[PDB]
Symmetry: C2
Subunit: 163 residues, 2 copies
């Protein structure tokens, strides 16, 4: 019942994402839903259900930041990503929050995308390259260099995109 509950929430997330044009989270939802099925884990399914609910609620509002990080978390949890990719996505999450409090919606949106791609592709080399870019963006934000922060975030998106 938990497994079906989670899978139901992922299908609504995939549906809503496709309707909104957010192919990234729709792809993630579809991959996560498969992972939830194969693992057959009650506890894992519950956790994915919460994250999927968060993403679904965020995307209904239009909050790509919350939608994509909640999606990225679901991909991390479903894939059981416990390593360099997991730490990278955490840094991107740490950075996105920093951007939000700094009134920097632009980088926060960009960083949110990077986290979802890094979670999806799960390549350790990409994880470190992006983690390197994320730290530079973090110092830029902490210093008030909003411009250099965005540039580092845009680089992170391109390197993730090409991967």
């Amino acid at each position: 019942e938990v497994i079906e509950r989670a899978r139901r929430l992922l299908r609504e997330l995939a549906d809503l994402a496709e309707e909104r044009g957010d192919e990234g989270v729709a792809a993630a939802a579809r991959e996560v839903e498969r992972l939830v099925a194969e693992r057959g884990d009650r506890e894992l399914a519950a956790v994915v259900a919460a994250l999927a609910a968060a993403a679904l609620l965020a995307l209904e509002r239009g909050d790509e930041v919350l939608a994509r990080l909640a999606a990225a978390a679901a991909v991390l949890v479903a894939k059981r990503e416990r390593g360099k990719v997991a730490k990278a996505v955490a840094e991107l999450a740490r950075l996105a929050r920093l951007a939000l409090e700094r009134g920097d919606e632009e980088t926060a949106r960009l960083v949110a995308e990077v986290a979802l791609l890094v979670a999806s592709k799960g390549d350790d080399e990409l994880a470190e390259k992006v983690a390197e870019l994320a730290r530079e963006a973090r110092d830029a934000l902490e210093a008030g260099d909003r411009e250099r922060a965005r540039e580092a975030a845009e680089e992170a998106l391109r390197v993730a995109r090409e991967a």
Copy 2:
């Protein structure tokens, strides 16, 4: 390291929630962090870290509903609750989603708190009472009776807070 990673996220969640006045969420974070430490379970720490990050980002965004629901999830996972309390939190979460979609943000907020309290206390009896009040609030929502929906959620909150 995951375990300390989780515990750090729970402490900031407790701090920020305390600063926002959402003592319900702060109390949950402190209880969950104690469980994460005592259990010393890497896998539990990883998933709880995910929820704590979700809740923490939710409060940064301003969405108390999402913050409290993510906290309620973390409490359920940490406490390993798969009974009447678990089903209640699920029903309450769906009710919060319905309230938000129906443009009744207040009831969604109240209902979100109820879910966190029901998760924390883990009373099967409280779970059942709240389940009845939740259905009344849902039916009110489906009809467009926001006032009775709010009233039923407020009743659920009052029963959840006082239950020990």
